[PDB]
Design a protein around this nucleic acid. Structure first.
Length: 669
RNA sequence: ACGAUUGCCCCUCACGAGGGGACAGCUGGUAAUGGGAUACC
DNA sequence: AAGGTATCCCATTACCAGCTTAACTACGCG
DNA sequence: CGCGTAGTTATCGACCAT
């Protein structure tokens, strides 16, 4: 529904889009102080690109009064949500809870859902808007998909009409309702405590109802004082007893030998960095407790205390926090509406647009939108153009250019081609070894969860598995083991079959008729090993794999490795960005990446060819293509980078990056 | 002789600590992928 | 260019919806 | 009268290619 405010803005300010905060204030002035007084407010202050992004900052809950589920707001939110998601379409259209306290109570009575003693107009409006938003979102997404399919079919049908054969007439709308009007696959509830203004965090001051764990025994912190810096400036002055004492042998860089055991160990020494994070060490967990930044969030008779060291660290890293700063100043760097994660006890603050605001491009530019963007950015200054090509032998290959502009054209100086260093390649290898080791550790620890009898049964069979299959196969079909090469066995080789046919007993057991997913193919050696491995008893297998399932479900390791790979994918695009930026010596560097559809660029596991490695598990060899494609597409929004997804049409004319650049400088494929 | 308190990831360690790294994150509904076990032709 | 399929189990992602306030004013009460 | 708690009320503008 069109708004009156849009009219005055569109009528006076055609192309001067303003950020959300100015929009809110400007509407209030218009509604109160007449139509003419918003123009005087919005004439002075405008932005070319309004910061529409707030980075997140995460802290840790210290203690609560009772579990979040008990809290009335969490129960009221749960009761409201699961009632609205089970409505039909017609009931939802005629279900208006107003934004006032009076309409809230009218709603809770006309529908019969209860609020368990909690009514804050601001809090309820958040739950109501989010729930109505999710309900319409699960309907919007389907409708958008129907529109997109129709548009795509229609547009291709123009070419089909133009010179095509008789064309597809139509296709069927995909609905997102049930036959009775209800919502099929409706969204699930969200357990997010969306904090608001009347509840916003504020510096802890001691009230008797709030009682803290025994470590925070005396907590005093003047919220308006400047929180001191922890470390002394050169940490080699701390003496023996006090915590955080850097021993002598670790100050100087070099290599030396330990007293207990003799190994040559490189020590880099104290880091010669100017933005190095400082790590602090306390004598006990009580001294650590007295050095926290505690803030409270109170909503009623039940509170929650949060530790804000997380926001300080996240603020000192972006350098948006002076070296002396108070707790209240720290809190004013962020919005007063955190998002508590109740099932993980993590609170997510965000920065105010003033503290750290950037533009976030909604989409990566493609097709015919690169040349026109390059026409604009190059009118004034020169912009570097790093072209990235992903693969599996070489994770990234990069070619840096500097696309300058001559009158009515775009030049492209080729500047430098490089690949990511051996350090990042070692980390990719070490991540794949860690994954294999974890999998082997899990396997070896599922074995220990069996009783001693089945435990021995599995241990023995796994120990002799390959020998048993080899000897059983040779004896059954008479093949001599020495005559047949074993180590040169691959996934599709046919060495067993040729030895069989050289013996020529029959062709029945070997050739087979693959059911189409009529050609006849001799069954391969991987198939022979599988069909001849000694299977383990059905009861022992059920126990063993159930133990493995249990260990896997409650394993902290998979989160470690997924985070490890993600941070290694981002680390490998930051080197790329920093290298192009220090070489091209230009403010603006925009990566140009292939428009690869990542769904088919997943890798696979690999086993070294051989008979011994038919019965082992596949070493993990998945490709980082998906990781790095997302990391560049995330570079678009986090740091307002331009990104170019550009199809690499093949040509003769190092070749892969040139062609990405060549389809960038011109929209045509 | 200088520099950011918790947390998270990696590595070293004389267990005193040191070096490097990510920092847009939550939900939700679906869909794919990788791996593993088994059964059959 | 991995013979396919079918039951299960674990893990991770991708794609796409929803999200991630605050200025001003109004009472109740010590 | 000041301080703690809580109600009113403001806006959201979004691409290529099949």
């Amino acid at each position: 529904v069109e708004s009156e405010f849009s009219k005055v803005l569109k009528k006076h300010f055609p192309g001067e889009r303003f950020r959300s905060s100015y929009m809110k204030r400007g509407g209030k002035i218009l509604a109160a102080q007449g139509e003419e007084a918003v123009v005087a407010y919005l004439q002075g202050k405008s932005e070319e690109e309004p910061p529409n992004f707030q980075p997140p900052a995460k802290c840790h809950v210290v203690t609560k009064s009772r579990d979040f589920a008990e809290w009335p707001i969490m129960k009221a939110s749960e009761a409201i949500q699961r009632y609205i998601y089970a409505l039909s379409t017609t009931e939802r259209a005629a279900c208006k809870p107003g934004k006032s306290s009076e309409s809230h109570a009218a709603w809770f009575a006309a529908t019969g859902v209860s609020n368990h003693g909690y009514s804050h107009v601001q809090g309820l409006n958040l739950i109501f808007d989010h729930t109505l938003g999710r309900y319409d979102g699960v309907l919007k997404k389907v409708q958008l998909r129907n529109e997109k399919a129709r548009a795509r079919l229609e547009s291709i049908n123009a070419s089909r009409a133009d010179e095509g054969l008789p064309e597809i007439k139509a296709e069927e709308e995909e609905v997102a309702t049930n036959e009775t009007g209800h919502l099929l696959q409706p969204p699930g509830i969200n357990p997010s405590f969306y904090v608001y203004q009347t509840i916003s965090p504020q510096a802890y001051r001691p009230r008797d109802e709030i009682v803290l764990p025994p470590e925070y025994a005396g907590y005093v912190r003047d919220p308006n004082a400047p929180i001191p810096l922890g470390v002394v400036r050169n940490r080699c002055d701390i003496q023996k007893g006090c915590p955080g004492y850097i021993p002598e042998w670790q100050r100087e860089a070099g290599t030396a030998i330990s007293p207990k055991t003799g190994k040559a160990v490189t020590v880099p020494g104290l880091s010669p960095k100017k933005n190095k994070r400082m790590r602090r060490y306390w004598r006990s967990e009580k001294e650590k407790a007295q050095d926290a930044l505690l803030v409270t969030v109170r909503i009623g008779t039940d509170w929650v205390v949060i530790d804000v060291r997380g926001l300080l660290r996240n603020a000192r890293w972006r350098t948006i926090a002076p070296k002396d700063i108070s707790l209240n100043a720290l809190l004013d760097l962020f919005t007063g509406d955190p998002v508590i994660d109740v099932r993980r006890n993590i609170v997510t603050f965000t920065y105010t647009l003033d503290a750290c605001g950037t533009y976030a491009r909604k989409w990566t530019l493609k097709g015919k939108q690169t040349k026109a963007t390059l026409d604009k950015l190059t009118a004034t200054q020169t912009v570097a153009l790093v072209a990235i090509d992903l693969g599996q032998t070489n994770p990234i290959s990069a070619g840096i250019s500097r696309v300058t502009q001559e009158n009515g054209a775009l030049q492209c100086e080729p500047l430098d081609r490089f690949t990511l260093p051996d350090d990042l390649l070692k980390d990719i290898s070490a991540y794949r070894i860690a994954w294999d080791r974890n999998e082997e550790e899990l396997r070896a620890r599922s074995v220990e969860a069996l009783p001693e009898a089945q435990q021995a049964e599995v241990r023995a069979l796994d120990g002799v598995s390959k020998e048993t299959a080899r000897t059983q196969l040779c004896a059954d079909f008479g093949l001599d083991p020495k005559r047949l090469p074993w180590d040169k066995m691959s996934s599709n080789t046919t060495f067993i079959s040729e030895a069989l046919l050289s013996n020529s007993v029959s062709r029945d057991q070997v050739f087979f008729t693959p059911a189409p997913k009529p050609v006849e193919v001799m069954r391969k050696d991987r198939t022979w090993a599988r069909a001849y491995k000694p299977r383990l008893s059905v009861e022992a297998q059920k126990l063993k794999n159930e133990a493995l399932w249990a260990l896997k479900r409650t394993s902290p390791e998979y989160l470690k490795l997924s985070r490890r790979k993600e941070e290694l994918c981002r680390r490998s695009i930051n080197y790329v960005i920093e290298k192009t930026r220090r070489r091209t010596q230009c403010q603006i560097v925009i990566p140009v990446i292939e428009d690869l559809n990542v769904r088919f660029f997943h890798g696979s596991g690999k086993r070294l060819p051989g008979w011994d490695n038919f019965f082992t598990a596949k070493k993990e060899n998945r490709w980082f293509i998906q990781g790095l494609h997302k990391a560049f597409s995330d570079l678009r929004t986090h740091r307002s980078f331009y990104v170019f997804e550009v199809r690499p049409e093949r040509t003769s004319i190092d070749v892969a990056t040139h062609n990405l650049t060549q389809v960038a400088l011109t929209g045509k494929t």
